[PDB]
Structure formats: structure tokens, C-alpha cells
Amino acid sequence: MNKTELINAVAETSGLSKKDATKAVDAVFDSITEALRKGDKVQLIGFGNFEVRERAARMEIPASKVPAFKPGKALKDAVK
Amino acid sequence: MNKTELINAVAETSGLSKKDATKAVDAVFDSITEALRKGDKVQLIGFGNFEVRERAARMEIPASKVPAFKPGKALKDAVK
DSSP states (O other): OBHHHHHHHHHHHHOOOHHHHHHHHHHHHHHHHHHHHTTOOEEETTTEEEEEEEEOOBTTBOOEEEEEEEEOHHHHHHHO | OBHHHHHHHHHHHHOOOHHHHHHHHHHHHHHHHHHHHTTOOEEETTTEEEEEEEEOOBTTBOOEEEEEEEEOHHHHHHHO
């Protein structure tokens, strides 16, 4: 499933037009990206959580930030 | 940021009403969950990819499926 297909699925099940579904899909992902940028954690009931972890400085290799996702029980169970 | 706050952010930036933004947010996450359930991979340009990995059977511990996320370059760079 790619982005175009996700937008089509969102449009079809929500009743929004494809133009509005597009706006909403972009806003979801842009919002999550902005929250992480600020160093906040995005906690979504049922789905999972997004957070940023810092990878430690070492061996003359600087520290860096890594976006990460932890699946929630609901997603873990649906996939099993 | 929790789900309610994500919905508010989506409503505010997309121009949709909070009721429609709710529908769209749920559809995004339900769609991604359904795609994984089917064993498909969700590839979203800029953000990242979701996929299911099988954890191997071993030591009289059965195999199991794990939902996973790989961040895309765009998200990696925005967060750094």
C-alpha cells in the first residue's frame, strides 16, 4: 500500500472527497513529524507510540537523534 | 501529543471539521492496521514504512509476528 492508495482508502471509508482526504493524510503525517521535531512523544491509543531517542556519542562519532515507533497491544494483536 | 490533540491539529490545518478530522484520523490508522494484517507493506514517501516481520521459532517457543516501522530519510532529517 502506498500513499495514493492510503488516501483512496481514507476517502472511501470516511466519505471525504479525495482532495480533502489528501489534505487530512498530509496533515496527520506533517503533525506527527512536527511533534517529534519539538521532541514531544506522539501517543496513539491502540496503534502505538512515536518518540525520538538519542544515540550516544562514541569513538569520535557524534551523538545523533533517531525517530522510533513502538507498536501498541492493539496493533500487535491484529497482526498476529 | 495524544490522539485528541492530533485530531485538533489535523482539523486546524486542513480546514475539516473536528468530526470529519476524527473520521479521517481513524481511517488512516485502521487502514494501515488492515494492510499489515493482510501482510502488505505500507510505504509512505517521506515518512517511513510499516511492515510485519516474523520472529523465528526456537527453544520450544513458537514463531510470532511483529509489526515494525522504518523511518524514511525525510523524517530522519527533520528530527536531527
